[PDB]
Structures are given as structure tokens and as C-alpha cells.
Amino acid sequence: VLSEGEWQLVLHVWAKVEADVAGHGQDILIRLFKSHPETLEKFDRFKHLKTEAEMKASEDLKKAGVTVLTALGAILKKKGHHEAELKPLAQSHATKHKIPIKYLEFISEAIIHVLHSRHPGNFGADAQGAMNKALELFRKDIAAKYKELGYQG
Ligand code: HEM
Ligand SMILES: O=N[O-]
Ligand SMILES: O=N[O-]
Numbered sequence: 542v543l544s545e546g547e548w549q550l551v552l553h554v555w556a557k558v559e560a561d562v563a564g565h566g567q568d569i570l571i572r573l574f575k576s577h578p579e580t581l582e583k584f585d586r587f588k589h590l591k592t593e594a595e596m597k598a599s600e601d602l603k604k605a606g607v608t609v610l611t612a613l614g615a616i617l618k619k620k621g622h623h624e625a626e627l628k629p630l631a632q633s634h635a636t637k638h639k640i641p642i643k644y645l646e647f648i649s650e651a652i653i654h655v656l657h658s659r660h661p662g663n664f665g666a667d668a669q670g671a672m673n674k675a676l677e678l679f680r681k682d683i684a685a686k687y688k689e690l691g692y693q694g
């Protein structure tokens with residue numbers, strides 16, 4: 542359970558993300574796909590992309606990045622009261638897309654990497670710790686939902 546001070550660290554860096562959600566989404570998806578190339582295989586519209594340049598030029602990848610970060614943002618803004626948001630997301634990611642928890646860990650690591658690179662003014666150790674706690678909460682609650690839904694994860 543996060544403190545209010547922890548949530549405020551999360552939401553203060555999130556506010557900078559929101560200055561340019563598309564750009565942050567490109568950087569985050571690209572980092573995930575470079576760091577864990579097996580994750581790209583889940584994305585049928587652009588799994589054929591071979592290079593970072595191709596990835597940066599992809600309008601479909603850009604839209605996916607906007608979608609992920611906007612949904613995550615909405616969850617973070619609930620400050621842990623995210624049961625309603627998590628229901629459809631857990632169902633799609635468990636049953637349609639088949640995203641294991643380990644892949645949710647990889648995208649969390651990609652998020653942290655990019656925020657650390659882009660936002661050293663709002664992403665020092667305490668803020669990174671708060672973001673990691675928020676993302677660990679998200680993953681814990683999604684994993685519990687996966688289990689309810691019948692998915693090993
Ligand atoms: C913070 C974690 C994540 C959030 C908030 C998120 C959110 C979303 C949302 C909102 C959509 C569109 C609606 C839906 O289908 O549910 C979506 C689609 C999808 N997500 Fe995620 N997602 C996350 C992590 C992942 C990860 C790690 C992968 C794969 C490694 C993944 C794969 C997909 C796929 C394949 C789609 C369908 C995209 C398409 O139609 O081409 N997601 N996700
Ligand atoms: O205010 N304690 O995070
Ligand atoms: O996408 N940078 O590792």
C-alpha cells in the first residue's frame with residue numbers, strides 16, 4: 542500500500558510523461574522490444590519490425606504506445622483504487638493477448654528505464670522507488686485477476 546507522498550512522486554513524474562505521451566510510448570515500447578525481443582511477437586500489427594528506426598517510423602507502434610501509457614496513467618491516477626480499470630485489461634491480456642506476468646515485469650522495467658533517462662528532475666531514487674511500488678501493486682493485482690480468470694500468467 543503506497544503512502545500519499547509515494548503517490549505524489551508517481552503522479553509528478555507522470556505529469557511530465559503527459560507532456561508528450563506518444564514520444565514516451567515510442568521510447569518505452571522500443572526499449573521493451575530491444576531488451577526482450579520475444580515480447581514483440583505478441584503484437585501482430587508490427588511484429589515484423591526489424592530495427593529501432595522502423596519502430597520509430599511506425600504509426601501503429603506509436604498508437605500502441607499512446608494506448609498503453611494512457612491506460613496505465615488512468616490506473617495510476619486511481620492511487621490503488623483501480624479494480625474497475627483492471628477488469629477489462631486483465632481479461633484482454635490474459636485471454637486474448639496472452640501476456641505473462643514476466644512480460645508485465647519487462648514493460649515495468651522499460652518504463653522505469655525511460656523515466657530515469659528522460660526525467661532525472663522528477664525521477665531520483667525516492668521517486669523511482671515510489672514508481673516501482675506502484676507498478677508492483679499493479680502487477681500484483683493483475684496477477685490475482687489472471688488467477689481468477691483461469692490464466693497461469
Ligand atoms: C502496463 C502494462 C500494460 C497496459 C496498461 C496495457 C494496456 C493495453 C490496452 C489499453 C490495450 C488496448 C485494449 C485491450 O486490448 O485491452 C492493449 C492492447 C494490447 N496489449 Fe497491452 N498493456 C500493457 C502491457 C502489455 C504487454 C507487456 C504486452 C506484450 C508484451 C501487451 C500486449 C498487448 C497487445 C498484443 C495488445 C493488442 C494490440 C493490438 O491490437 O495490436 N500489453 N494493452
Ligand atoms: O510520506 N511517506 O511516504
Ligand atoms: O531503447 N534503448 O535501449
Ligand SMILES: O=N[O-]
Pocket residue numbers: 604607608611612
Ligand atoms: O489512444 N489513447 O488512449
Ligand SMILES: O=N[O-]
Pocket residue numbers: 605606609
Ligand atoms: O503495449 N502494451 O499494450
Ligand SMILES: O=N[O-]
Pocket residue numbers: 623624625627682683686
Ligand atoms: O484491485 N484490482 O484488481
Ligand SMILES: O=N[O-]
Pocket residue numbers: 628629632
Ligand atoms: O469488465 N470486464 O470485462
Ligand SMILES: O=N[O-]
Pocket residue numbers: 629632633634636637
Ligand atoms: O477482452 N478481451 O479482448
Ligand SMILES: O=N[O-]
Pocket residue numbers: 572573576647650651652654
Ligand atoms: O528495459 N529495462 O531496463
